Write a protein that binds this ligand. Structure first.
Ligand SMILES: [Zn+2]
Lengths: 108, 108, 71, 119, 177
RNA sequence: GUUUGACCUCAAAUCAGGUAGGAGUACCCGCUGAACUUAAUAUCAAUAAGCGGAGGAAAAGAAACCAACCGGGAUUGCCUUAGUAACGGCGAGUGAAGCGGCAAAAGCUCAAAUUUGAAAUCUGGUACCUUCGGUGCCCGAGUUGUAAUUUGGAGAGGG
RNA sequence: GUUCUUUGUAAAGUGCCUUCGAAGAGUCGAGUUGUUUGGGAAUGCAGCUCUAAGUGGGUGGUUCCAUCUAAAGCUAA
RNA sequence: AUGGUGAA
C-alpha cells in the first residue's frame, strides 16, 4: 500500500525547483505563449482551453519565422489543423499582442 | 585477351587526381578536370541522365545485385556498356582498393 | 566430508564433488538466492574489511581531485 | 631525533639507500636487544624513519617515471588517475560537447535569446 | 541513389536471380561457423537505412539460428553475448533454410574514437545503452514487447509488469477522497 | 614475365590502444515460471521462486495517435472519468481508455535529391604546442559511399 | 564588466517569380499451430506456408467518409 | 509448489 505522506515535501520541492528555474532564466516567464483552443468531445466543446502550440499558418499570419517564434518563447504546433477562423483570428491577435509587448535584450 | 590490357593502359591516362597529386597542386598554387568515373552512386546518377558515355562493370562483384541491374539500365539508355575483369587493376587505376565500376564521360 | 573453501573458507567444500555449497565455488558467479534472506545479509558487503570501498564515498565527496594542497 | 621529509627529499638516491641500510641495521640490532628492555620507543622511531625513507624513495622513483613519460601519450596506467571505471567511460568533455554541423548552423542562425515581458 | 534500384530488385524476392543468389549464399554460409565476422554487409540497402556506415568502428556479424521468442531477438542476444564490447545497433534477416535462418547484425564499437567523437553516433557510447539487446530496446525487441501507439497496445503501452503494478497497487492520500 | 605487383580470405605476435566477466539488486528492462484459495480452465496470477542486462532513476517519448465535434496534438505522473463501458457459468468475480482538472514541456538525426568544377571525409603513428585537445608530416579505413543541405513540420535547382 | 580581438568575394533565411519534388518488403497483411490476455468480432507475441502497392497504404465511424504516413535512430523535466 | 543440500 502506497500513502502520499510526502505531499507537503513534494510541494516544497516543486516550489524550490520553480524558484531555481526562475533564478536561472529570470528574463523568461518559465512558460511559453500558447494558443486558445476549442475542445473536442462536444460534452466539453463550449469550454475554451489552451493548446500545445500555434500552427504554422498562425505563425505565418503573425508574420514571424517558426524558428524565431521557438526562440522567442512562442509554442508552435506543426501538426495542428486550421478548420476554424474565429480561433485563428484570436490566436493571431494574441500572438501580435505578445510580440508587441515583449522586449528583446540586445548583446550591446 | 589483349583488349583488356589495352583498355586498362588507355584508362591509365585518365587516372583520377590522387591524394599526392592533389597535395602537390595545392602546394604549388599556395578548364575543368577530366578523369574516369569510379563512384557507383554518381556513375548511376550520370546513367539515366545520359551524361555517361562509356561504362565498364566489374564481373566479380560479390553483391551480384549491385551489377545485375546495371546492364539493363545501360541498354535502356543506350550508353555503351561492357563487362570487365581485374578488379585489382580497376582499383589500381582508380587509386583505391576497388571501385566495381569505371565510367567515362569527357573522353578526349 | 567437507573441507575449507579457498573463496570463503566456510568449511563447506565437498571433496567428492569438488564444489562449495555455501558460496558456489568454483562457479564463476557467487551463489545467492532471494529466499535466503539471512544468507544474503551475512554475505552482503560491509561485513568484511571493505579496504577500498570505504574511501569511495570520500573520494566522490572530494570530487576525485588530484595534486596537493598549496598551503 | 627521527627524520623529516623536507630534509630527506634533498638527499641523493645513493644517500637515501645508505641511510635505509643503516636504519635497517639499527632496527635489527634493536630487535635483537628487545629481550633486554621493558620499553623501546627507539625501535618505533627507527621504524617510522625507515617508513619515511621508503616513502621518499618511492616518490623519487615515481617522479623519475613521470619525467621519463612526460609529454608522450599512452603513459603506464600506474600514473593515470584511478577515479572509477564508470568515469573512465562516459566520454570526456570534448566528446560530450561535440556537435554536428547541422545543429551548429541551426543554433548559430537561431540562438536562444533572453527577454523580459512586462511592457 | 543507386540503392533504390537494389531495393526495388529485392522487393520481388521470388525472382530467379534472387533465388539463385539465396541458394548459393545459404550453402556458402553452411560451411562456416554458427556466428562469424563479415567484412561488409551483403545488403547495403538494408544497412544504410538501418544506420550502418562505412566508417571505422562498425562491425557486421553473420549468425545462424536453428529453426523450429523472436528469432531476431535471440540472434541479437547470442551475438551480444560474444561481442561484449560491441553494442548491437540493428539486425536483419539475410537468408533462410529448411532448418536454419541467417541474420546479419550490425554493431557499433563504443570504444572507437571515431564513434566517440561522432556526435551523430556518440549517443550509443552512453552506459545506459550497455547490453541494449539484453533489454529488447532494439526494433525487434520493441516489436516483441508490443510498445506501440494505438488501442491495440493500450494494455502493454508501458510494460505489462508496470501496468499491473500501477493498476493493482493501492494509493491513499493524506486526506481521504 | 613458370618472376614480379595488386585485391580477397585464413592464420601467428609475451606488437600498440583498449573492452566483458563479478558483486550489489528497494526501483527498472526482457526470458522462464508454480502452488494454497476461489466460485487442468475464469480466479489465485501473467504473483512466489529462477535466469540475463542498466542508472540515479529506468522505460517510453515527439502519432501509419486520439476523436466523429464551429476537433484535439510527445512521453510521463496525480483527482475524476470508474467500480461506468466492457468481459465473465451475465452469476461469483475481473475490469479499462478518449475527453475534463493539475506538475513539467524541447524537439531533433539518417535511408532518401552526382560535391564529380576536384573522398573535398575519417581512424592510427611521429615532431611540436598553450594537453578532457590543436597544428606539420606519414600511414591506414573508405567509392560495396566517408564530405555538405535536407526528411512532406517538408525540401532542392535559378532569377 | 576587464575588455582580449577580427574578415570572410564569410554562412543561413525571409517574401515573390520560377523548374523540380524519392515516403523504410520475408515488411504490413491473410490462413494455420502455439504463448499471454477480463482484449471488445482471440487482440498483443512466437513457429509454420504465402506475402502483396504507390497521388498508395494503416486505424476507426457508415456502400462511403474522418484521420495519420509504420516496418530506421536519439532526446533532461 | 520454487530454489539448494547429503546419501547403503
Ligand atoms: Zn566457498
Amino acid at each position: 500500500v502506497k500513502v502520499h505522506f510526502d505531499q507537503a515535501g513534494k510541494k516544497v520541492s516543486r516550489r524550490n525547483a520553480r524558484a531555481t528555474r526562475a533564478a536561472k532564466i529570470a528574463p523568461r516567464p518559465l512558460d511559453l505563449l500558447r494558443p486558445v483552443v476549442r475542445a473536442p468531445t462536444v460534452k466539453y466543446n463550449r469550454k475554451v482551453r489552451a493548446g500545445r502550440g500555434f500552427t504554422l499558418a498562425e505563425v505565418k499570419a503573425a508574420g514571424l519565422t517558426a524558428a524565431y517564434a521557438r526562440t522567442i518563447g512562442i509554442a508552435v504546433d506543426h501538426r495542428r489543423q486550421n478548420r476554424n477562423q474565429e480561433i485563428f483570428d484570436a490566436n493571431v491577435q494574441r500572438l501580435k499582442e505578445y510580440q508587441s509587448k515583449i522586449i528583446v535584450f540586445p548583446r550591446n | 585477351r589483349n583488349t583488356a590490357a589495352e583498355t586498362f593502359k588507355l584508362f591509365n591516362k585518365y587516372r583520377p587526381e590522387t591524394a599526392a597529386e592533389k597535395k602537390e597542386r595545392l602546394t604549388k598554387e599556395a578548364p575543368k578536370p577530366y578523369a574516369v568515373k569510379y563512384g557507383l552512386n554518381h556513375v548511376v546518377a550520370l546513367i539515366e541522365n545520359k551524361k555517361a558515355k562509356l561504362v565498364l562493370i566489374a564481373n566479380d562483384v560479390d553483391p551480384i545485385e549491385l551489377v545485375v541491374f546495371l546492364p539493363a539500365l545501360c541498354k535502356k539508355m543506350g550508353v555503351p556498356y561492357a563487362i570487365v575483369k581485374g578488379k585489382a587493376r580497376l582499383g589500381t587505376l582508380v587509386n583505391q582498393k576497388t571501385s566495381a565500376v569505371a565510367a567515362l564521360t569527357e573522353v578526349r | 566430508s567437507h573441507t575449507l573453501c579457498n573463496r570463503c573458507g566456510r568449511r563447506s567444500f565437498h571433496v567428492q564433488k569438488k564444489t562449495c555449497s555455501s558460496c558456489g565455488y568454483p562457479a564463476a558467479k557467487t551463489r545467492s538466492y532471494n529466499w535466503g534472506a539471512k544468507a544474503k545479509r551475512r554475505h552482503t558487503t560491509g561485513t568484511g574489511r571493505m579496504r577500498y570501498l570505504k574511501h569511495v564515498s570520500r573520494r566522490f565527496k572530494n570530487g576525485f581531485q588530484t595534486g596537493s594542497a598549496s598551503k | 631525533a627521527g627524520v623529516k621529509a623536507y630534509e630527506l627529499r634533498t638527499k641523493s638516491k645513493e644517500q637515501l639507500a645508505s641511510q635505509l641500510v643503516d636504519l635497517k641495521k639499527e632496527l635489527a640490532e634493536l630487535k635483537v636487544q628487545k629481550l633486554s628492555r621493558p620499553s623501546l620507543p627507539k625501535i618505533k622511531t627507527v621504524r617510522k624513519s625507515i617508513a619515511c625513507v621508503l616513502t621518499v624513495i618511492n616518490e623519487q622513483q615515481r617522479e623519475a617515471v613521470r619525467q621519463l613519460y612526460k609529454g608522450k601519450k599512452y603513459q603506464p596506467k600506474d600514473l593515470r588517475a584511478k577515479k572509477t571505471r564508470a568515469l573512465r567511460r562516459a566520454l570526456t568533455k570534448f566528446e560530450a560537447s561535440q556537435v554536428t554541423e547541422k545543429q551548429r548552423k541551426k543554433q548559430i542562425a537561431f540562438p536562444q535569446r533572453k527577454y523580459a515581458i512586462k511592457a | 541513389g543507386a540503392y533504390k534500384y537494389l531495393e526495388e530488385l529485392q522487393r520481388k524476392k521470388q525472382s530467379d536471380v534472387l533465388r539463385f543468389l539465396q541458394r548459393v549464399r545459404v550453402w556458402e554460409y553452411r560451411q562456416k561457423n554458427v556466428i562469424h565476422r563479415a567484412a561488409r554487409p551483403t545488403r547495403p540497402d538494408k544497412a544504410r537505412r538501418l544506420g550502418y556506415k562505412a566508417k571505422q568502428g562498425f562491425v557486421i556479424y553473420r549468425v545462424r539460428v536453428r529453426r523450429g521468442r523472436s528469432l531476431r531477438a535471440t540472434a541479437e542476444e547470442r551475438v551480444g553475448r560474444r561481442a561484449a564490447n560491441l553494442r548491437v545497433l540493428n539486425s536483419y534477416w539475410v537468408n533462410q533454410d529448411s532448418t536454419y535462418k541467417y541474420f546479419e547484425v550490425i554493431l557499433v564499437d563504443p570504444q572507437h574514437k571515431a564513434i566517440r567523437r561522432d556526435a551523430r553516433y556518440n549517443w550509443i557510447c552512453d552506459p545506459v545503452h550497455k547490453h541494449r539487446e539484453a533489454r529488447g530496446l532494439t526494433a525487434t525487441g520493441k516489436k516483441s514487447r508490443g510498445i506501440n501507439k494505438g488501442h491495440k497496445f493500450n494494455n502493454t503501452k508501458a510494460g505489462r509488469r508496470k501496468t499491473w503494478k500501477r493498476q493493482n497497487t493501492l494509493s491513499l492520500w493524506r486526506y481521504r477522497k
